[PDB]
Amino acid sequence: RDATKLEATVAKLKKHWAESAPRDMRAAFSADPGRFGRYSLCLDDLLFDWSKCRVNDETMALLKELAVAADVEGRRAAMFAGEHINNTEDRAVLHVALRDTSSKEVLVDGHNVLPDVKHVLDRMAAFADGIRSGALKGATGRKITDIVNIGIGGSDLGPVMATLALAPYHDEPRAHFVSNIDGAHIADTLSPLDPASTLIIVASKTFTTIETMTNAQTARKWVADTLGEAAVGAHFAAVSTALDKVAAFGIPEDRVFGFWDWVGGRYSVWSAIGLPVMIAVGPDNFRKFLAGAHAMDVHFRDAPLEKNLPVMLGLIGYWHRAICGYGSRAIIPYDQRLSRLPAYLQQLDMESNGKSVTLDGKPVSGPTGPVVWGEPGTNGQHAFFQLLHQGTDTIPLEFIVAAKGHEPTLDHQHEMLMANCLAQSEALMKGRTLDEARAQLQAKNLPASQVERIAPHRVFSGNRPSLTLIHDMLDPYTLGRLIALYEHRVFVEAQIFGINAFDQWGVELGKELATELLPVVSGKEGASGRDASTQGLVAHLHARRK
Amino acid sequence: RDATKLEATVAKLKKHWAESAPRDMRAAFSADPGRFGRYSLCLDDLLFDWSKCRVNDETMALLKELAVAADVEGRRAAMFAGEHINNTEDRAVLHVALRDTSSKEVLVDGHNVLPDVKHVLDRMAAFADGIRSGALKGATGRKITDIVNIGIGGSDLGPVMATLALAPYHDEPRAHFVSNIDGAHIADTLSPLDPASTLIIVASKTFTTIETMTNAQTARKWVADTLGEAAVGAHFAAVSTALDKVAAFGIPEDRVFGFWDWVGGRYSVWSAIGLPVMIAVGPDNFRKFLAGAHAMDVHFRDAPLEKNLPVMLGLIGYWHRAICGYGSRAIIPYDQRLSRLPAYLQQLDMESNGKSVTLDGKPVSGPTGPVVWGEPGTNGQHAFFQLLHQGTDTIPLEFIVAAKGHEPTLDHQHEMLMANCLAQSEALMKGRTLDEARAQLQAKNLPASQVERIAPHRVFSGNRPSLTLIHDMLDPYTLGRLIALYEHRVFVEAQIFGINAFDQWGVELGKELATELLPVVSGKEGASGRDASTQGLVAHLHARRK
Ligand SMILES: [Ca+2]
Ligand SMILES: [Ca+2]
Ligand SMILES: [Ca+2]
Ligand SMILES: [Cl-]
Ligand SMILES: [Cl-]
Ligand SMILES: [Cl-]
């Protein structure tokens, strides 16, 4: 890594944005239709087109220089090598090992981790098969009809996202996900269910995660109240490494599935944490999900910078955020089954890159992670695209769509879906001028004064950037490949930012203060010494609760 | 409205923010604990506390001057009076009339709308009661067990949000919501259902909404394929005013429920669009939902500026966006049942205020609507609060929480939920200095070298603003009151921005281009000279579809 060169290149990119980057995208496309080919890449059926971004050959040359000066490639090699690149926590970062079916070995501290990874998946598969087949029954001999995952953050969003995304691959048992400490979540989830046919999965590495374990004890009582204490072992599984604590809870060791310190929560869906996903779609589908991620990993590791999809995606995201000054990015998947992808991507991106200090503990040099937000298309069009088109800020779009849906009789609806996806990016680029707006109103034969009055309200600046990702069909493999692409774009951006993508020290202060405030809120102690707002809110809660 | 006074006051606010607004919030609270009282207001049980925002008495006086200069009060009166304040469409704006049980008359174009409003509600209630009781059966004589709403935008987000929010008040029948043109949505929703016990509600004022009516024809074929053509009339209701088209489709007169041009989509959950919510919770609960909104309407209309909750919420929202420069705001409801509130507020806020021209068609003077986003607490803490605490940008928080949950046996979970809510706002304000981070590490007896290595990563800037809203319990009335609060804050901000909150010209370009693109995507027509990216994406789709 070359700090001087990196800084010089950042400055060149800012000068370039100011003086040389394309301003009129209609004109750029008109004069230079070759830009589609130059600013797109494929990996197998996956097409990544960033040609509607405000870039030219000089932009891409500078971005390559940036990737080189940031040592994206060397930092990547360190990750794959099992080096302790999570420096603040002194840990390896090896979510890639979780889906690695090609390497002979991957070493962490002198130990080949691959056999352990594969052994856990094998045990998960045997368990999932048994639950799915009815071979493994509840305490009164019933086939399990419902599974309830209990976890927070990374122990939840991945499982939810993937399970919903793979609905066509999921039959019985039904899958439910509890995460909020709010009692509404566990209460509303368990109330319609029968304990006799329900499996609870408790996802916590330590088995002391306060919110998860509080929910877990509520579920434990729900089982034991109806089926008796002895039934707990037939109605629970644990995703945990705290073998002492899982035994104390009454979960047999053959229903406990572990993972490792080098699996970050927001990168854990590939591990034992994905157990509810594997129960939902079956082990074969879960392994296809792993295989798709693995294909993206091999590509990420091996493709030269100019052909490397995640590197280009990270470079373009960095461009948008740090150089163009866009504070957010909207990720709009044109697939209702990806309804919970944006929320997943919020954790992956924002918790990784929402950082103000570098690896070495110094203040960062520019903006770091942007706000990530979105909803599926077409839904989002009818909620907030008004602002994306006519708002005062430019917000870059990341579009995702499949060439084929899963409904053989509704391909016409899929055609409308695709047309809308392509039309929105086209609209953001081309806009509509006052003359064009005027002409449309004149064609309705409105009075001249009304045309003149309304026309300015129908103007669209255009030149708003977007990129589009197209895959053949959202199947397990394609989903895995998509998530991995985003894991690696986030890695890339973090390296350019100079931050640790793999720690999360920013959650500690809230936890600390929540621990102090619990007995205060519960009426067990005073809010003496705290700020007057915290005091006033505590006082109000107490008054309203009395 | 005084444009020169308004510009002057904005300039004063910018100068005040730079030079005089509080920079050290710990000091601001410790020196002046009275700030909690001065920067909070109540309406009945509803507490609104903005004392953790970066404001003092001079900020608040300037914001009052701003409201006066913008003629917030005159514009509000014009809304309540039925004037055509949606000037670009030449329409009144009277969502407030939909819940108005106190006024003698509300006039639009000389006609009292209140009796029509109340008559539609009465008809909806009779229908809802019949469906709920089993008096109104399917074509083969079954009690309806499932309702499926089909709509886009404002015909979907409100129904979804409110039905989830009021889960404790919803028994039978089950409620489902279809919106995406993606065939996955209607197929996944209808697949498990029995047409014999299913009622489809088609929400489209025109009954020509392309996505909704495509979905509606798919649902109609689903009913007719199993039950026969004649059965359609017993399995559909319409929220529409297109009486000829509704009759042609097969929907009887007594199951069509209308609304008016002065009800905007994103303000429509109070109208006949709320029918599925009314079938879910019952008419008595729906009327309580309206009553809560009405209580907030009367307050908004009648309270003086500095005692007016929506006015002060809009002024603080404007301050954050236009003065402090915060491009987004995070709305974090500490209630799992409000899981779809942020998505609802995105449409309400962003589609209203994501505008670049003033009422008179001139370019706006500064930033308009911000990006609105969020997830419920505590879930969001474990997803993205890392970034909210330690990211490079400050993003203001709007917290919402209840003093009491619906599960007495889980009130300890509710105490944890409230403690986390208060801890997050406290943490955002207070932060943690380097010496404070070091002291925590030193208390764990870590080596000095480790203390110095780690401490900078555990620093929190603090001084990050938030406001908190507390209500006693999320019941129908409280939900109604909360949504109305946000309708009116959006109103208030729009008046300061000088824009039309009530049009949405920005959705037209995308629709236009999607209509054109459909036959090109389908292959029904050849190419016709679009940009190389659109062409490239089309060619890829054709290639992958065979
Ligand atoms: Ca399925
Ligand atoms: Ca203190
Ligand atoms: Ca800003
Ligand atoms: Cl996590
Ligand atoms: Cl004109
Ligand atoms: Cl009609």
PDB file of N, CA, C and O in Angstrom, chain A residues 49 52 180-182 188 211 218 321 336-337 354 356 377-378 382 386 390 393 411 413 432 458 472 506 508 512 530 533 544-545, chain B residues 49 52 180-182 211 218 321 336-337 354 356 377-378 382 386 390 393 411 413 426 432 458 472 506 508 512 533 544-545:
ATOM      1  N   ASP A  49     -23.529  -4.140 -15.620  1.00  0.00           N
ATOM      2  CA  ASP A  49     -23.470  -2.975 -16.510  1.00  0.00           C
ATOM      3  C   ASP A  49     -23.470  -1.702 -15.685  1.00  0.00           C
ATOM      4  O   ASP A  49     -24.481  -1.336 -15.077  1.00  0.00           O
ATOM      5  N   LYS A  52     -24.281   3.381 -17.360  1.00  0.00           N
ATOM      6  CA  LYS A  52     -25.125   4.546 -17.099  1.00  0.00           C
ATOM      7  C   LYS A  52     -24.534   5.369 -15.954  1.00  0.00           C
ATOM      8  O   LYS A  52     -25.092   6.431 -15.584  1.00  0.00           O
ATOM      9  N   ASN A 180     -36.403  -9.505  17.661  1.00  0.00           N
ATOM     10  CA  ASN A 180     -36.608  -8.363  18.558  1.00  0.00           C
ATOM     11  C   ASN A 180     -36.710  -8.802  20.028  1.00  0.00           C
ATOM     12  O   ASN A 180     -37.293  -9.840  20.316  1.00  0.00           O
ATOM     13  N   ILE A 181     -36.168  -8.005  20.962  1.00  0.00           N
ATOM     14  CA  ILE A 181     -36.393  -8.278  22.373  1.00  0.00           C
ATOM     15  C   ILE A 181     -37.846  -7.927  22.750  1.00  0.00           C
ATOM     16  O   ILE A 181     -38.385  -8.444  23.732  1.00  0.00           O
ATOM     17  N   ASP A 182     -38.474  -7.049  21.970  1.00  0.00           N
ATOM     18  CA  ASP A 182     -39.881  -6.705  22.152  1.00  0.00           C
ATOM     19  C   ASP A 182     -40.651  -8.023  22.241  1.00  0.00           C
ATOM     20  O   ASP A 182     -40.556  -8.841  21.314  1.00  0.00           O
ATOM     21  N   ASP A 188     -46.240 -13.162  19.218  1.00  0.00           N
ATOM     22  CA  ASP A 188     -46.977 -13.294  17.954  1.00  0.00           C
ATOM     23  C   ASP A 188     -46.530 -14.520  17.128  1.00  0.00           C
ATOM     24  O   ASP A 188     -47.337 -15.120  16.417  1.00  0.00           O
ATOM     25  N   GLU A 211     -30.374 -10.592  24.552  1.00  0.00           N
ATOM     26  CA  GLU A 211     -31.709 -10.549  23.942  1.00  0.00           C
ATOM     27  C   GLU A 211     -32.117 -11.920  23.464  1.00  0.00           C
ATOM     28  O   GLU A 211     -33.222 -12.382  23.742  1.00  0.00           O
ATOM     29  N   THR A 218     -37.956 -17.716  27.088  1.00  0.00           N
ATOM     30  CA  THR A 218     -39.406 -17.613  26.864  1.00  0.00           C
ATOM     31  C   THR A 218     -39.935 -18.796  26.037  1.00  0.00           C
ATOM     32  O   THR A 218     -40.954 -19.422  26.397  1.00  0.00           O
ATOM     33  N   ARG A 321     -19.704   7.561  -3.581  1.00  0.00           N
ATOM     34  CA  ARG A 321     -19.715   8.040  -2.194  1.00  0.00           C
ATOM     35  C   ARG A 321     -18.638   9.070  -1.919  1.00  0.00           C
ATOM     36  O   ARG A 321     -18.921  10.197  -1.541  1.00  0.00           O
ATOM     37  N   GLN A 336     -39.690  -9.829  -5.908  1.00  0.00           N
ATOM     38  CA  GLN A 336     -40.393  -9.759  -4.640  1.00  0.00           C
ATOM     39  C   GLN A 336     -39.759 -10.690  -3.597  1.00  0.00           C
ATOM     40  O   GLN A 336     -39.814 -10.398  -2.412  1.00  0.00           O
ATOM     41  N   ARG A 337     -39.168 -11.807  -4.037  1.00  0.00           N
ATOM     42  CA  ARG A 337     -38.554 -12.752  -3.107  1.00  0.00           C
ATOM     43  C   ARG A 337     -37.279 -12.174  -2.481  1.00  0.00           C
ATOM     44  O   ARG A 337     -36.798 -12.683  -1.489  1.00  0.00           O
ATOM     45  N   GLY A 354     -19.249   1.555   8.319  1.00  0.00           N
ATOM     46  CA  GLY A 354     -19.632   2.740   9.084  1.00  0.00           C
ATOM     47  C   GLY A 354     -18.625   3.029  10.187  1.00  0.00           C
ATOM     48  O   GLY A 354     -18.912   2.802  11.380  1.00  0.00           O
ATOM     49  N   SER A 356     -14.979   5.514  11.452  1.00  0.00           N
ATOM     50  CA  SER A 356     -14.296   6.826  11.352  1.00  0.00           C
ATOM     51  C   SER A 356     -12.809   6.757  11.648  1.00  0.00           C
ATOM     52  O   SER A 356     -12.119   7.778  11.642  1.00  0.00           O
ATOM     53  N   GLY A 377     -38.270  -3.775  -6.448  1.00  0.00           N
ATOM     54  CA  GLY A 377     -39.053  -3.247  -7.566  1.00  0.00           C
ATOM     55  C   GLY A 377     -40.042  -4.326  -7.970  1.00  0.00           C
ATOM     56  O   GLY A 377     -39.763  -5.486  -7.749  1.00  0.00           O
ATOM     57  N   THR A 378     -41.199  -3.989  -8.534  1.00  0.00           N
ATOM     58  CA  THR A 378     -41.623  -2.625  -8.829  1.00  0.00           C
ATOM     59  C   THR A 378     -42.080  -1.791  -7.614  1.00  0.00           C
ATOM     60  O   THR A 378     -42.269  -0.582  -7.770  1.00  0.00           O
ATOM     61  N   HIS A 382     -43.364   2.976  -6.718  1.00  0.00           N
ATOM     62  CA  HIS A 382     -44.616   3.557  -6.313  1.00  0.00           C
ATOM     63  C   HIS A 382     -44.560   4.134  -4.900  1.00  0.00           C
ATOM     64  O   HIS A 382     -45.579   4.542  -4.363  1.00  0.00           O
ATOM     65  N   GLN A 386     -40.228   8.853  -6.965  1.00  0.00           N
ATOM     66  CA  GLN A 386     -40.482  10.295  -7.116  1.00  0.00           C
ATOM     67  C   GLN A 386     -39.251  11.104  -6.711  1.00  0.00           C
ATOM     68  O   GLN A 386     -38.781  11.980  -7.447  1.00  0.00           O
ATOM     69  N   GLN A 390     -36.758  13.324  -9.023  1.00  0.00           N
ATOM     70  CA  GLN A 390     -37.007  14.761  -8.952  1.00  0.00           C
ATOM     71  C   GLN A 390     -36.571  15.419  -7.648  1.00  0.00           C
ATOM     72  O   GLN A 390     -36.726  16.634  -7.499  1.00  0.00           O
ATOM     73  N   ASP A 393     -31.172  15.822  -4.266  1.00  0.00           N
ATOM     74  CA  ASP A 393     -29.921  15.089  -4.216  1.00  0.00           C
ATOM     75  C   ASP A 393     -29.942  14.006  -5.286  1.00  0.00           C
ATOM     76  O   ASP A 393     -31.002  13.462  -5.600  1.00  0.00           O
ATOM     77  N   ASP A 411     -45.133 -15.412 -17.358  1.00  0.00           N
ATOM     78  CA  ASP A 411     -43.962 -14.788 -17.951  1.00  0.00           C
ATOM     79  C   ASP A 411     -44.286 -13.388 -18.492  1.00  0.00           C
ATOM     80  O   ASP A 411     -43.400 -12.536 -18.528  1.00  0.00           O
ATOM     81  N   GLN A 413     -46.037 -11.204 -16.871  1.00  0.00           N
ATOM     82  CA  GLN A 413     -45.745 -10.372 -15.714  1.00  0.00           C
ATOM     83  C   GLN A 413     -44.266 -10.180 -15.496  1.00  0.00           C
ATOM     84  O   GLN A 413     -43.812  -9.087 -15.119  1.00  0.00           O
ATOM     85  N   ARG A 432     -35.980  14.348 -18.894  1.00  0.00           N
ATOM     86  CA  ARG A 432     -36.960  14.952 -19.797  1.00  0.00           C
ATOM     87  C   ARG A 432     -36.803  16.448 -19.688  1.00  0.00           C
ATOM     88  O   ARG A 432     -36.835  16.997 -18.585  1.00  0.00           O
ATOM     89  N   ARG A 458     -42.869  18.842 -14.650  1.00  0.00           N
ATOM     90  CA  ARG A 458     -42.677  17.559 -15.324  1.00  0.00           C
ATOM     91  C   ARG A 458     -41.268  17.414 -15.928  1.00  0.00           C
ATOM     92  O   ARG A 458     -41.048  16.550 -16.784  1.00  0.00           O
ATOM     93  N   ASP A 472     -29.638 -15.139 -14.667  1.00  0.00           N
ATOM     94  CA  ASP A 472     -30.662 -15.903 -15.404  1.00  0.00           C
ATOM     95  C   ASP A 472     -31.941 -16.128 -14.584  1.00  0.00           C
ATOM     96  O   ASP A 472     -33.055 -15.943 -15.080  1.00  0.00           O
ATOM     97  N   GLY A 506     -18.613   0.112  17.446  1.00  0.00           N
ATOM     98  CA  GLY A 506     -19.619   1.159  17.545  1.00  0.00           C
ATOM     99  C   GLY A 506     -20.929   0.708  18.159  1.00  0.00           C
ATOM    100  O   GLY A 506     -21.812   1.521  18.365  1.00  0.00           O
ATOM    101  N   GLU A 508     -20.906  -0.905  21.162  1.00  0.00           N
ATOM    102  CA  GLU A 508     -20.648  -1.099  22.581  1.00  0.00           C
ATOM    103  C   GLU A 508     -21.259  -0.042  23.523  1.00  0.00           C
ATOM    104  O   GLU A 508     -21.674  -0.381  24.625  1.00  0.00           O
ATOM    105  N   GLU A 512     -23.748  -0.774  26.703  1.00  0.00           N
ATOM    106  CA  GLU A 512     -23.282  -0.364  28.018  1.00  0.00           C
ATOM    107  C   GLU A 512     -24.363   0.432  28.738  1.00  0.00           C
ATOM    108  O   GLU A 512     -24.702   0.155  29.900  1.00  0.00           O
ATOM    109  N   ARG A 530     -27.743  11.357  35.288  1.00  0.00           N
ATOM    110  CA  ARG A 530     -27.849  11.280  33.839  1.00  0.00           C
ATOM    111  C   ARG A 530     -28.367  12.605  33.273  1.00  0.00           C
ATOM    112  O   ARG A 530     -28.814  13.470  34.019  1.00  0.00           O
ATOM    113  N   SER A 533     -32.738  14.786  29.633  1.00  0.00           N
ATOM    114  CA  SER A 533     -33.654  14.155  28.685  1.00  0.00           C
ATOM    115  C   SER A 533     -33.838  12.703  29.084  1.00  0.00           C
ATOM    116  O   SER A 533     -34.958  12.231  29.252  1.00  0.00           O
ATOM    117  N   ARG A 544     -46.421   6.960  33.351  1.00  0.00           N
ATOM    118  CA  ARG A 544     -47.432   6.344  32.497  1.00  0.00           C
ATOM    119  C   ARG A 544     -47.663   4.882  32.870  1.00  0.00           C
ATOM    120  O   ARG A 544     -48.756   4.355  32.680  1.00  0.00           O
ATOM    121  N   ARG A 545     -46.641   4.241  33.427  1.00  0.00           N
ATOM    122  CA  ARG A 545     -46.751   2.832  33.798  1.00  0.00           C
ATOM    123  C   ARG A 545     -47.431   2.606  35.177  1.00  0.00           C
ATOM    124  O   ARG A 545     -47.942   1.500  35.427  1.00  0.00           O
TER     125      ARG A 545
ATOM    126  N   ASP B  49     -40.093  14.686  22.630  1.00  0.00           N
ATOM    127  CA  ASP B  49     -38.878  15.273  23.245  1.00  0.00           C
ATOM    128  C   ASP B  49     -37.795  15.484  22.197  1.00  0.00           C
ATOM    129  O   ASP B  49     -37.224  14.509  21.696  1.00  0.00           O
ATOM    130  N   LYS B  52     -32.502  16.478  22.929  1.00  0.00           N
ATOM    131  CA  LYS B  52     -31.204  15.982  22.463  1.00  0.00           C
ATOM    132  C   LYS B  52     -30.801  16.506  21.075  1.00  0.00           C
ATOM    133  O   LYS B  52     -29.699  16.204  20.617  1.00  0.00           O
ATOM    134  N   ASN B 180     -46.459  -6.268  -6.036  1.00  0.00           N
ATOM    135  CA  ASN B 180     -45.455  -6.346  -7.089  1.00  0.00           C
ATOM    136  C   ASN B 180     -46.065  -6.877  -8.378  1.00  0.00           C
ATOM    137  O   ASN B 180     -46.912  -7.765  -8.338  1.00  0.00           O
ATOM    138  N   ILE B 181     -45.685  -6.314  -9.527  1.00  0.00           N
ATOM    139  CA  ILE B 181     -46.068  -6.922 -10.815  1.00  0.00           C
ATOM    140  C   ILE B 181     -45.349  -8.280 -10.975  1.00  0.00           C
ATOM    141  O   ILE B 181     -45.819  -9.152 -11.692  1.00  0.00           O
ATOM    142  N   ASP B 182     -44.202  -8.449 -10.314  1.00  0.00           N
ATOM    143  CA  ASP B 182     -43.489  -9.717 -10.294  1.00  0.00           C
ATOM    144  C   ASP B 182     -44.492 -10.832  -9.980  1.00  0.00           C
ATOM    145  O   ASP B 182     -45.128 -10.795  -8.954  1.00  0.00           O
ATOM    146  N   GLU B 211     -50.270  -2.370 -13.366  1.00  0.00           N
ATOM    147  CA  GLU B 211     -49.794  -3.485 -12.515  1.00  0.00           C
ATOM    148  C   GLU B 211     -50.910  -4.137 -11.715  1.00  0.00           C
ATOM    149  O   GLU B 211     -51.079  -5.384 -11.736  1.00  0.00           O
ATOM    150  N   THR B 218     -55.106 -11.923 -13.061  1.00  0.00           N
ATOM    151  CA  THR B 218     -54.529 -13.185 -12.610  1.00  0.00           C
ATOM    152  C   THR B 218     -55.338 -13.799 -11.446  1.00  0.00           C
ATOM    153  O   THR B 218     -55.643 -14.993 -11.465  1.00  0.00           O
ATOM    154  N   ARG B 321     -32.260  18.866   7.927  1.00  0.00           N
ATOM    155  CA  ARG B 321     -32.010  18.682   6.484  1.00  0.00           C
ATOM    156  C   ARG B 321     -31.406  19.918   5.825  1.00  0.00           C
ATOM    157  O   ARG B 321     -30.338  19.851   5.228  1.00  0.00           O
ATOM    158  N   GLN B 336     -41.920  -4.153  17.334  1.00  0.00           N
ATOM    159  CA  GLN B 336     -41.837  -5.105  16.214  1.00  0.00           C
ATOM    160  C   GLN B 336     -43.072  -5.008  15.339  1.00  0.00           C
ATOM    161  O   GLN B 336     -42.996  -5.230  14.129  1.00  0.00           O
ATOM    162  N   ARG B 337     -44.212  -4.627  15.916  1.00  0.00           N
ATOM    163  CA  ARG B 337     -45.441  -4.526  15.104  1.00  0.00           C
ATOM    164  C   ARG B 337     -45.397  -3.334  14.124  1.00  0.00           C
ATOM    165  O   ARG B 337     -46.180  -3.280  13.169  1.00  0.00           O
ATOM    166  N   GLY B 354     -39.876  14.993  -2.226  1.00  0.00           N
ATOM    167  CA  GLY B 354     -38.765  14.821  -3.173  1.00  0.00           C
ATOM    168  C   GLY B 354     -39.056  15.572  -4.467  1.00  0.00           C
ATOM    169  O   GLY B 354     -39.419  14.973  -5.488  1.00  0.00           O
ATOM    170  N   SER B 356     -38.121  19.356  -6.856  1.00  0.00           N
ATOM    171  CA  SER B 356     -37.049  20.298  -7.216  1.00  0.00           C
ATOM    172  C   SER B 356     -37.589  21.628  -7.724  1.00  0.00           C
ATOM    173  O   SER B 356     -36.819  22.542  -8.044  1.00  0.00           O
ATOM    174  N   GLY B 377     -36.504  -0.999  16.316  1.00  0.00           N
ATOM    175  CA  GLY B 377     -35.602  -1.361  17.427  1.00  0.00           C
ATOM    176  C   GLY B 377     -36.230  -2.559  18.145  1.00  0.00           C
ATOM    177  O   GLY B 377     -37.450  -2.646  18.187  1.00  0.00           O
ATOM    178  N   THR B 378     -35.439  -3.473  18.729  1.00  0.00           N
ATOM    179  CA  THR B 378     -33.980  -3.355  18.795  1.00  0.00           C
ATOM    180  C   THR B 378     -33.270  -3.854  17.522  1.00  0.00           C
ATOM    181  O   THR B 378     -32.076  -3.647  17.391  1.00  0.00           O
ATOM    182  N   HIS B 382     -28.649  -3.887  15.834  1.00  0.00           N
ATOM    183  CA  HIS B 382     -27.766  -4.981  15.517  1.00  0.00           C
ATOM    184  C   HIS B 382     -27.500  -5.055  14.032  1.00  0.00           C
ATOM    185  O   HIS B 382     -26.866  -6.011  13.565  1.00  0.00           O
ATOM    186  N   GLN B 386     -24.051   0.737  14.373  1.00  0.00           N
ATOM    187  CA  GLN B 386     -22.617   0.959  14.166  1.00  0.00           C
ATOM    188  C   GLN B 386     -22.357   2.224  13.393  1.00  0.00           C
ATOM    189  O   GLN B 386     -21.565   3.059  13.820  1.00  0.00           O
ATOM    190  N   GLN B 390     -20.675   5.701  14.689  1.00  0.00           N
ATOM    191  CA  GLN B 390     -19.261   5.874  14.337  1.00  0.00           C
ATOM    192  C   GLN B 390     -18.965   6.139  12.875  1.00  0.00           C
ATOM    193  O   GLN B 390     -17.786   6.224  12.493  1.00  0.00           O
ATOM    194  N   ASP B 393     -20.824  10.429   8.583  1.00  0.00           N
ATOM    195  CA  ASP B 393     -21.938  11.376   8.538  1.00  0.00           C
ATOM    196  C   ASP B 393     -22.770  11.301   9.812  1.00  0.00           C
ATOM    197  O   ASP B 393     -22.941  10.243  10.377  1.00  0.00           O
ATOM    198  N   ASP B 411     -43.496  -8.342  30.324  1.00  0.00           N
ATOM    199  CA  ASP B 411     -43.184  -6.933  30.561  1.00  0.00           C
ATOM    200  C   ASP B 411     -41.685  -6.733  30.838  1.00  0.00           C
ATOM    201  O   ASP B 411     -41.159  -5.664  30.566  1.00  0.00           O
ATOM    202  N   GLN B 413     -39.306  -8.085  29.136  1.00  0.00           N
ATOM    203  CA  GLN B 413     -38.822  -7.814  27.779  1.00  0.00           C
ATOM    204  C   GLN B 413     -39.147  -6.410  27.327  1.00  0.00           C
ATOM    205  O   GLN B 413     -38.323  -5.751  26.686  1.00  0.00           O
ATOM    206  N   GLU B 426     -29.297   8.434  24.387  1.00  0.00           N
ATOM    207  CA  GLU B 426     -28.293   8.861  25.362  1.00  0.00           C
ATOM    208  C   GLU B 426     -26.872   8.722  24.800  1.00  0.00           C
ATOM    209  O   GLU B 426     -26.069   9.647  24.912  1.00  0.00           O
ATOM    210  N   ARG B 432     -18.214   9.061  23.790  1.00  0.00           N
ATOM    211  CA  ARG B 432     -17.173   8.550  24.669  1.00  0.00           C
ATOM    212  C   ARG B 432     -15.862   9.071  24.147  1.00  0.00           C
ATOM    213  O   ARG B 432     -15.535   8.884  22.969  1.00  0.00           O
ATOM    214  N   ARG B 458     -12.662   2.864  19.900  1.00  0.00           N
ATOM    215  CA  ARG B 458     -13.773   2.835  20.855  1.00  0.00           C
ATOM    216  C   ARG B 458     -14.255   4.248  21.210  1.00  0.00           C
ATOM    217  O   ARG B 458     -15.025   4.438  22.153  1.00  0.00           O
ATOM    218  N   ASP B 472     -48.569   5.722  25.287  1.00  0.00           N
ATOM    219  CA  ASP B 472     -48.827   4.722  26.345  1.00  0.00           C
ATOM    220  C   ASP B 472     -48.785   3.292  25.830  1.00  0.00           C
ATOM    221  O   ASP B 472     -48.159   2.416  26.432  1.00  0.00           O
ATOM    222  N   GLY B 506     -43.070  13.019 -10.718  1.00  0.00           N
ATOM    223  CA  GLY B 506     -41.817  12.296 -10.887  1.00  0.00           C
ATOM    224  C   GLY B 506     -41.932  10.817 -11.194  1.00  0.00           C
ATOM    225  O   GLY B 506     -40.921  10.182 -11.484  1.00  0.00           O
ATOM    226  N   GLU B 508     -43.955   9.722 -13.641  1.00  0.00           N
ATOM    227  CA  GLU B 508     -44.479   9.595 -15.001  1.00  0.00           C
ATOM    228  C   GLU B 508     -43.464   9.082 -16.036  1.00  0.00           C
ATOM    229  O   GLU B 508     -43.826   8.301 -16.899  1.00  0.00           O
ATOM    230  N   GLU B 512     -43.953   5.892 -18.571  1.00  0.00           N
ATOM    231  CA  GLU B 512     -43.921   6.120 -20.005  1.00  0.00           C
ATOM    232  C   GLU B 512     -42.903   5.194 -20.688  1.00  0.00           C
ATOM    233  O   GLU B 512     -43.232   4.511 -21.656  1.00  0.00           O
ATOM    234  N   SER B 533     -26.933   1.173 -23.468  1.00  0.00           N
ATOM    235  CA  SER B 533     -27.066   0.375 -22.260  1.00  0.00           C
ATOM    236  C   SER B 533     -28.428  -0.331 -22.271  1.00  0.00           C
ATOM    237  O   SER B 533     -28.494  -1.544 -22.113  1.00  0.00           O
ATOM    238  N   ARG B 544     -30.542 -14.707 -23.041  1.00  0.00           N
ATOM    239  CA  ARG B 544     -30.664 -15.634 -21.917  1.00  0.00           C
ATOM    240  C   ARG B 544     -32.051 -16.307 -21.871  1.00  0.00           C
ATOM    241  O   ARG B 544     -32.212 -17.357 -21.235  1.00  0.00           O
ATOM    242  N   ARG B 545     -33.051 -15.695 -22.515  1.00  0.00           N
ATOM    243  CA  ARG B 545     -34.409 -16.261 -22.556  1.00  0.00           C
ATOM    244  C   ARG B 545     -34.639 -17.224 -23.743  1.00  0.00           C
ATOM    245  O   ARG B 545     -35.700 -17.825 -23.850  1.00  0.00           O
TER     246      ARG B 545
END
